[PDB]
Design a protein around this nucleic acid. Structure first.
Lengths: 93, 107, 121, 195, 99, 192
RNA sequence: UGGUAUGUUC
RNA sequence: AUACUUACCUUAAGAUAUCAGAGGAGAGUCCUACUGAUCAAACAUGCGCUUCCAAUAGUAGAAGGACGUUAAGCAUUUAUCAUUGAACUAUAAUUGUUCAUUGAAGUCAUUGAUGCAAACUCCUUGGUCACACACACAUACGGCGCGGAAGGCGUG
RNA sequence: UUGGGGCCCUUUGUUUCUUCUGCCUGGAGAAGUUUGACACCAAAUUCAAAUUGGUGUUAGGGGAGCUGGGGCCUUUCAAAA
RNA sequence: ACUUUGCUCGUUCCCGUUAUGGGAAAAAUUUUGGAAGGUCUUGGUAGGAACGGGUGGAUCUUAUAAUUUUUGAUUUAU
């Protein structure tokens, strides 16, 4: 259905992440609320245009197809989404 | 009637692939996804006579020492421009389309 | 690089390998994969992104090449703007040690299910 | 369908309004915070030692090393090393949690204390403080604390508190010293201090 | 008619009916009368070849490919004869059939 | 749907005289009660009449400058009156259930046993016994401590703070029912 | 035929 | 932990490898602890197979780096436009030269950026293993030790 | 059981399976081990203490018995020259 | 191909006889498959088999060749 990477992107909500866009502009800020379509909203945004300059947005909202990548913090190195043999405690009928 | 199932019958076939960037990849096929994400081994890839982005993509894969010899490359579907099959393979027997034959028999 | 990547392996078998994944730009990401999906969205542990400058490209056109490396750490890369992925370096622990670790994870998961069944009673 | 890996709870068909409300509730917060704390504690506490490589040492190194001296090994009992390592763990966590807060209490009567140090009238991150108040939908969380708020507004000017010494200040804290090396303090002061 | 509400497992019959009596009349005529067609691609790679198979994605198998492109610096034409080819429908600009 | 293109095709197919029974008049005027209770626990099921956006835009363009239709307004008034009567019957049933819970058999027996022992010094003893009976009544009422919502007919609480109450007022049921009460009061002010 | 979250009393 | 109120929601389907033959069920479909063949997975197992596994008869060195130093190393290149005033080269929205009033944004960086090149130091990895400090080879090298890591092929 | 010689003790919590005692004039002793036990984190109950939710560990080597598979030799049956 | 009659060569044994025939085994020996024993080496030693699912996770097909990856505006050219 959804998959592991979109669940990991929805996992790190409310944390300082860093995006890079397809044009080359790198954003960095606190993730407000991520979605399954990766259309992600950031706050306290610092932006670097592909020309080179640095600016600051207050509340950005980027579409998921114009994202090169996004960096989650390192404590999500150890996540239960990464566990291969985690069993399921009795799903409901 | 997707012809990716035609490429699924092409295991251990020694082919070339021209990509959309311009790189020619000579290697044997191992497997291919139904989304045409094809893996290859015993690979040499070459950017012919330019595109500096393609030269960067050619060199920055490890194993350059402009023919680059690599052991294992997975290739995404949308980067495949065309794939050239060996002429010794018979296309009349590999394109039998047994799924299409079962669909015609089910009609 | 004398690694001898497996001849009949796929993305479920290439997990926890130090990949060297190529993109459309050529911005090569080096790091361990830990997950994928249908769109080939790859998470990358201890990842580094390497490029070549425009001045180095003239020397690269037909020796030493000074690549520009930035450190990303644990990132999550999309499958749209990527081109190809290879296996660069083998992981630390071996296949038998990963097998013993997977058996320990299975026994720990079965013990956790027995603990949930004991707490449910 | 949706399954929380943290809380080990299932759900109905995947609604964004239900999944958003699941990551706000207090049980998911407790389980998630405890899981992150325990995984960080495990990856700190895991002493991944190097695999030892012992080679057949040289002859003259053996005649030099076995004749210089023989050192003495110190070692302790089980309860002693357990108590010492527990004190070292609480010292490491209290050093990881602490921070120097001298500039906040040292510029307390400054005329721009209500514009930078108040941390609510701050410009760049003050909207983040004013946004999530944790609005305390429980009545007991609002009825528990009965002390003053002492919320310093931005509009406080220099006309208020003109003389900082008449309005009773606090004497500054002394430079704290290590308790394990507290026996080497000069016991005689330079000047006579009363009270 | 909406695509999701037609039927189940009978969409292949409608796809074959669109193949016989739709825009696919030229790819069908080339594979049954073995006439050579000229496919112009998105990077000036003009292909003169015969069609072997049809796909929903216009993935076409071509036999006895004579391809030609033009390098503009000065102006040269470079050609290549390729025996077997599997062309993706992403690269295809246009397909011309000769009588 | 799993693809958004089929969702957009559905929006186009449902977006593209006028006095016909197929057009929902409560939705043609606005705020149909079968629309304001679609997926909640107080759902009526599915509206038998069809809803359309082009007819709603034509009705808005007609009511902007052209004219107004009193028959659809009277039908919406009758539907709102029937739904308000059903909700008032539900609120009266909830008030009767609250009065039956406040007048249970064992609770009235305990209250009568406390009041039978409730009878200067005698006045102070009677005041202390009345305070003890009031404390027992407060402990009996605090076992549930459920009030009655004056508008939507739900259950509320007095010791609950204003934030959980504000979370209660921002629901689909309460917003829809306050809008239906505003429409009913506007139609009763226009008719009378 | 149900699930998630929250607030009171024992 | 029990009891109750409230807020949101209540589900895209079909299937689990392929081919040939025989039998059964009222041209088409289903089943066979039915038979032959291909393929996949798991467990064992062997191929004088393919690659690698760091001195100790010393104070070293192989692979990958430093987001380390010398190093502000050496050689180059840039660091805003317009109106007007006192002269002005002048096809421009006076571009060029010296000085200034004013007008819109106005990356920090010039100890900056690119290229070139050497030395030093420090990090992660290993069989730092068992015998010996030894005279072999045109069919070029007795690959006929105990293993480990990666892979190929073959068998059950 | 004692004594001698060589190496290692980074095992850095001085063996790291756990607990307790204990150690460089030594390298040890006692108990337990998967519906259990051990260690730790977080909290409101106003010291300590107790309760609840989770995390991680329960190991390595050798030997008797049983079983699966690989290679060699021997005995017997069926088939082909 | 069956069948008979005698000659010649011949694996082994017997007999008429060591020329040569008669009879028997129609054999000693090589390979394959199956049954048993001995020796060398390796793995495992507490879970396994059957059935049931308004079971969970993976794989294929169609929605889905149209703005969210995967059926293209990244070889910088008029």
């Amino acid at each position: 259905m959804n998959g592991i990477p979109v669940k990991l992107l929805n996992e790190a909500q409310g944390h300082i992440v860093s995006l890079e866009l397809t044009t080359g502009a790198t954003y960095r800020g606190k993730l407000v609320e991520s979605e399954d379509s990766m259309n992600v909203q950031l706050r306290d945004v610092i932006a670097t245009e592909p020309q080179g300059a640095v600016t600051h947005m207050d509340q950005i909202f980027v579409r998921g197809s114009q994202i090169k990548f996004i960096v989650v913090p390192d404590l999500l190195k150890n996540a239960p989404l990464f566990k291969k043999n985690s069993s399921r405690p009795m799903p409901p009928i | 009637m997707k012809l990716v199932n035609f490429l699924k019958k092409l295991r251990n076939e020694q082919v070339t692939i021209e990509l959309k960037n311009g790189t020619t990849v000579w290697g044997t096929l191992q497997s291919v996804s139904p989304q045409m994400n094809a893996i290859l081994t015993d690979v040499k890839l070459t950017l012919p006579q330019s595109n500096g982005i393609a030269m960067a993509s050619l060199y920055l894969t490890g194993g350059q020492q402009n023919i680059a010899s690599l052991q294992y490359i997975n290739i995404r579907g949308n980067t495949i421009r065309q794939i050239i099959l060996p002429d010794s393979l018979n296309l009349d027997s590999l394109l039998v389309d047994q799924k299409q034959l079962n669909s015609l028999r089910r009609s | 690089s004398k690694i001898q990547v497996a001849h009949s392996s796929r993305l479920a078998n290439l997990i926890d390998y130090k990949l060297r994944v190529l993109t459309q730009d050529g911005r090569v990401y080096i790091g361990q994969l830990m997950a994928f999906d249908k769109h080939m969205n790859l998470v990358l542990n201890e990842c580094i992104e390497e490029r070549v400058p425009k001045t180095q490209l003239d020397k690269l056109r037909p020796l030493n090449i000074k690549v520009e490396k930035r450190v990303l750490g644990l990132t999550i890369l999309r499958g749209e703007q990527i081109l190809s992925t290879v296996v660069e370096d083998k992981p630390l622990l071996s296949k038998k040690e990963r097998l013993v670790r997977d058996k320990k994870e299975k026994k720990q998961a079965q013990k956790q299910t027995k603990l949930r069944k004991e707490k449910e009673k | 369908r949706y399954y929380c890996e943290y809380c080990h709870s299932y759900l109905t068909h995947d609604t964004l309004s239900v999944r958003k409300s699941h990551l706000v509730g207090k049980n998911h917060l407790r389980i998630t915070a405890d899981y992150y704390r325990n995984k960080a504690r495990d990856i700190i506490n895991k002493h991944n030692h190097k695999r030892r490589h012992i080679g057949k040492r040289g002859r003259k190194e053996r005649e030099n090393s076995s004749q210089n001296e023989t050192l003495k090994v110190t070692c302790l009992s089980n309860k002693e090393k357990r108590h010492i390592m527990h004190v070292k763990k609480m010292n490491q966590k209290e050093l990881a949690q602490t921070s120097i807060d001298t500039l906040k209490l040292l510029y307390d009567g400054s005329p721009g204390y209500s514009k930078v140090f108040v941390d609510a009238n701050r410009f760049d991150i003050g909207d983040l403080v004013k946004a999530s108040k944790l609005p305390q939908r429980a009545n007991e969380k609002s009825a528990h604390h009965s002390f003053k708020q002492t919320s310093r507004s931005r509009d406080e000017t220099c006309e208020s508190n003109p003389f900082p010494r008449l309005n009773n200040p606090k004497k500054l804290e002394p430079p704290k010293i290590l308790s394990q090396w507290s026996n080497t303090i000069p016991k005689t002061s330079i000047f006579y201090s009363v009270d | 008619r909406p695509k999701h509400e037609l039927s189940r497992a009978e969409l292949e019959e409608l796809e074959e009916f669109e193949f016989k009596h739709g825009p696919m009349s030229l790819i069908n005529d080339a594979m049954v009368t073995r006439t050579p067609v000229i496919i112009s691609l998105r990077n000036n790679h003009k292909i003169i070849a015969r069609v072997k198979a049809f796909d929903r994605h216009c993935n076409m198998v071509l036999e006895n490919v004579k391809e030609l492109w033009t390098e503009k610096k000065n102006v040269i034409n470079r050609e290549r004869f390729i025996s077997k080819l599997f062309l993706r429908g992403d690269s295809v600009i246009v397909v011309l059939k000769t009588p | 749907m799993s693809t958004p293109a089929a969702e957009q095709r559905k929006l186009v197919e449902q977006l593209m005289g006028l006095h016909d029974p197929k057009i929902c008049k409560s939705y043609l005027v606005g705020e149909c009660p079968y629309d304001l209770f679609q997926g909640t626990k107080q759902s009526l099921g599915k509206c038998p009449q069809m809803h359309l956006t082009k007819h709603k835009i034509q009705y808005e363009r007609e009511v902007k400058q052209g004219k107004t239709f009193p028959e659809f307004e009277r039908e919406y008034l009758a539907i709102l009156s029937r739904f308000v009567n059903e909700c008032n019957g539900q609120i009266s049933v909830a008030l009767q259930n609250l009065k039956h819970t406040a007048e249970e058999r064992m609770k009235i027996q305990q209250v009568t046993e406390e009041l039978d022992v409730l009878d200067l010094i005698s006045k102070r003893k009677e005041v202390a016994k009345r305070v003890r009976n009031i404390t027992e009544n407060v402990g009996q009422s605090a076992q549930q401590k459920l009030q009655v919502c004056e508008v939507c007919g739900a259950y509320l609480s007095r010791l609950d703070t204003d934030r959980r109450l504000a979370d209660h007022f921002l629901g689909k049921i309460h917003l829809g029912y306050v809008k239906m009460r505003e429409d009913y009061d506007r139609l009763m002010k226009n008719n009378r």
